[PDB]
Amino acid sequence: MQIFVKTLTGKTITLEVEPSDTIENVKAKIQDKEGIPPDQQRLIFAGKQLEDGRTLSDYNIQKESTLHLVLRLRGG
């Protein structure tokens, strides 16, 4: 199924994922697409964070769901 990952820059990344996909794997795909380390990848859905040890079915994520990718840093 198709999902829409939105960034703080206003970018809408379209990724191909399935219910059996893992949240960690999704972040890995984004790392290959934009080049953002998993440490700086915070996936938020409806205001809550998704655990890496969960699937899209665990959060009842259906088709055309919008994923909020929160950018971050720990430098200063």
Binding site: K6, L8, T9, G10, R42, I44, A46, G47, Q49, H68, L69, V70, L71, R72, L73
Partner: protein, 52 residues
Amino acid sequence: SNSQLNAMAHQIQEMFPQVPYHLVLQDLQLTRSVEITTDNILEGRIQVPFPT
């Protein structure tokens, strides 16, 4: 000018559909970066809407 600060907050408001906009606009003047604001929101920088 608050032209960029407001714009940045507007985007954050779409990422977190549960945070008060007036508060996001406030942090934007203290952090001045969406990379810090949005992240710090999860940490506990901005006071979440608690029934009071």
